[PDB]
């Protein structure tokens, strides 16, 4: 793969990167950069936490938004030179951004890609949209939930609807936190050295969503139907019960981590209600879920149930949970970038040299 396009999706927690045309990211590494805590000069990814002990670790991406441009540069460098092993200047590069990304950010990013990395061509696409594309639709409402943030994004004919976007500062990073908390409140000594890592694995291995939380609690109270076990490496085995479904419940009841916000079913419903009454039909029947925090077993049907209850009785609801939705966004991009009707949509270095960083903002 040379003279081919690159796809780079920068999550709050995870970076996904690869080549357009590929069915999956060749590179998935933690979105973190570490510099020597005292006085080589920088580390990124797995190696940065491997040596967390002698570095100050930082996260360029907070809430899905880029906040540290220097550190973000180191991430992109590590992406091209160290992960993909490619030269940016001979690959058009597609990049992804959060809904509601400020214009100054998009331009700052376009500006770096050109001046600093000297890529021949580039494009910025909104993450949620790519997810939708990945499913083969151009109309619907996406629920993207990654490590740092959660959005509801209504989309109509390839264009998102900014007035109707719902943002929720609750994602997997805080769900892992919640689980770590509870687990400990039951005598399980957990810290960050290496525990934080285990708590996350338990999360993705054992947690699931209850179709009926009140009802599911009573089950785990009257039998051991729902107990499951996890042997730590130390050796100490531990058992989990209602904790398996109480942790993800936080997505529907944020008041579990004490957030007086509303749950993803409500924000999904509110988001649709915020749209043209004539396209609601299309939206209700096209809930596409993306992100790693949507991977919980049972979340699709819980959502289906919750929404059927909020909406009109006559409307047909539908939830689409691609088994690949952990990587939907990236896949969405992988597809786009490879299509031929898209090849005219690239921003060329030439175009940028004439107009300026502002040559990356279109309406319609």
């Amino acid at each position: 793969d040379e003279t081919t396009a690159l796809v780079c999706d920068n999550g709050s927690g995870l970076v996904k990167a690869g080549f357009a045309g590929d069915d999956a990211p060749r590179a998935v590494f933690p979105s973190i950069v570490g510099r020597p805590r005292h006085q080589k000069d920088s580390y990124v990814g797995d190696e940065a936490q491997s040596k967390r002990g002698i570095l100050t670790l930082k996260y360029p991406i907070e809430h899905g938004i880029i906040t540290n441009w220097d550190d973000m540069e180191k991430i992109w460098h590590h992406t091209f030179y160290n992960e993909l092993r490619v030269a940016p200047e001979e690959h058009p590069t597609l990049l992804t951004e959060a809904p509601l990304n400020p214009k100054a950010n998009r331009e700052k990013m376009t500006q770096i890609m050109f001046e600093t990395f000297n890529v021949p061509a580039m494009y910025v696409a909104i993450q949620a949209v790519l997810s939708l594309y990945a499913s083969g639709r151009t109309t619907g409402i996406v629920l993207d939930s990654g490590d740092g943030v959660t959005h509801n994004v209504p989309i109509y004919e390839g264009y998102a609807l900014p007035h109707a976007i719902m943002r929720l500062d609750l994602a997997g990073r805080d769900l892992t936190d919640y689980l770590m908390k509870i687990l400990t409140e039951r005598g399980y000594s957990f810290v960050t050295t290496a525990e934080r890592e285990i708590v996350r694995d338990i999360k993705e291995k054992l947690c699931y969503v209850a179709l009926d939380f009140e009802n599911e609690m009573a089950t785990a109270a009257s039998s051991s139907s729902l107990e499951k076990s996890y042997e730590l490496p130390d050796g100490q085995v531990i058992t989990i019960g209602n904790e398996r479904f109480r942790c993800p419940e936080t997505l529907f009841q944020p008041s579990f981590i004490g957030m007086e916000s509303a749950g993803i079913h409500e924000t999904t419903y509110n988001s649709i209600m915020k749209c043209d009454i004539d396209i609601r039909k299309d939206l209700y029947a096209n809930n596409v879920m993306s992100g790693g925090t949507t991977m919980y077993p049972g979340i699709a049907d819980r959502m289906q149930k919750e929404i059927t209850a909020l909406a009109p009785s006559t409307m047909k609801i539908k939830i689409i949970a691609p088994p690949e939705r952990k990587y939907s966004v990236w896949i969405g991009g992988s597809i786009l970038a490879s299509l031929s009707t898209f090849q005219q949509m690239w921003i060329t270095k030439q175009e940028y040299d004439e107009a300026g960083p502002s040559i990356v903002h279109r309406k319609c």
Partner: peptide, 22 residues
Amino acid sequence: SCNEDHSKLMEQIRQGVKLKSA
């Protein structure tokens, strides 16, 4: 894009596509 070019991109997307397997 904003022209008689956005509709074909759209149509192409829905069409689908294969992706080199790794």
